[PDB]
Write a protein that binds this ligand. Structure first.
Ligand SMILES: Cc1cc2nc3c(=O)[nH]c(=O)nc-3n(C[C@H](O)[C@H](O)[C@H](O)COP(=O)(O)OP(=O)(O)OC[C@H]3O[C@@H](n4cnc5c(N)ncnc54)[C@H](O)[C@@H]3O)c2cc1C
Ligand SMILES: Cc1cc2nc3c(=O)[nH]c(=O)nc-3n(C[C@H](O)[C@H](O)[C@H](O)COP(=O)(O)OP(=O)(O)OC[C@H]3O[C@@H](n4cnc5c(N)ncnc54)[C@H](O)[C@@H]3O)c2cc1C
Lengths: 102, 106
């Protein structure tokens, strides 16, 4: 199930951070954190939503600018990778993967 | 044991008073801080099951932070949702106002 949908929700998350302002106002930061909660609510997976929340409360969003936000999603994604014993990618590989979007 | 019959009231009081002292003309910054505070409030709950229910409720019921009364109602409704899940009494809005009247200096 999530084998198919996981990659799509991840792309939705990473692109969101990518299209986030580099000079955000508090209104944008507020809409960003609400978007994240909404993103978590969308995940069609019980265990995923539970882990996602524990991560979020323990690791506050970093929204001073776009790449700050990107980094945050990158670390979150790698934390899940680590838990599922998947490859933990480097920052340079992250940038290559999303180079066209960035 | 979680001993929620003792700790439960303490947490509800912290939640309702936070909404009560929230500004009537909050800035976007205060709204942002309110959301982080709610997330930290849920994390502090002394029971796993309590955290999951609260988390589930939050994502399905976005915080209403236009002003203090709106935030107060959000906490009030959330509190009644837990009352219902525990088959406890569902108090009325006016009863809520009587209960916290001495702090609602609006
Ligand atoms: C928020 C969220 C939480 C999830 N939680 C769980 C869970 O707890 N348990 C469970 O079984 N499944 C979970 N999933 C699913 C899981 O993370 C995968 O999406 C899935 O199992 C399919 O694996 P995958 O190999 O295609 O890679 P991903 O779906 O992990 O792969 C996405 C693709 O993104 C890239 N990528 C890899 N690492 C990163 C990174 N750090 N930053 C940016 N891009 C990266 C690569 O190009 C890769 O092919 C979750 C999905 C989301 C979106
Ligand atoms: C987020 C959260 C989740 C919880 N989840 C669980 C759980 O999953 N399982 C479990 O066993 N316990 C749980 N508890 C505990 C539980 O809600 C009670 O606190 C507890 O059972 C004690 O009940 P009580 O009768 O003293 O009244 P509480 O519900 O503790 O009462 C606080 C008091 O506030 C008033 N009040 C009642 N309803 C409302 C309202 N809607 N708005 C404002 N005030 C009201 C009355 O003065 C009342 O005596 C949770 C607590 C919190 C804070």
């Amino acid at each position: 199930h999530m084998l198919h949908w996981g990659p799509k929700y991840w792309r939705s998350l990473h692109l969101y951070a990518i299209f986030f302002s580099d000079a955000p106002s508090w209104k944008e930061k507020y809409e960003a954190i609400q978007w994240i909660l909404n993103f978590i609510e969308s995940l069609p997976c019980t265990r995923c939503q539970h882990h996602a929340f524990s991560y979020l409360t323990k690791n506050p969003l970093t929204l001073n600018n776009s790449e700050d936000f990107q980094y945050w999603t990158f670390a979150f994604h790698n934390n899940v990778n680590n838990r599922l014993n998947k490859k933990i990618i480097s920052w340079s590989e992250y940038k290559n993967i999303y180079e066209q979007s960035i």
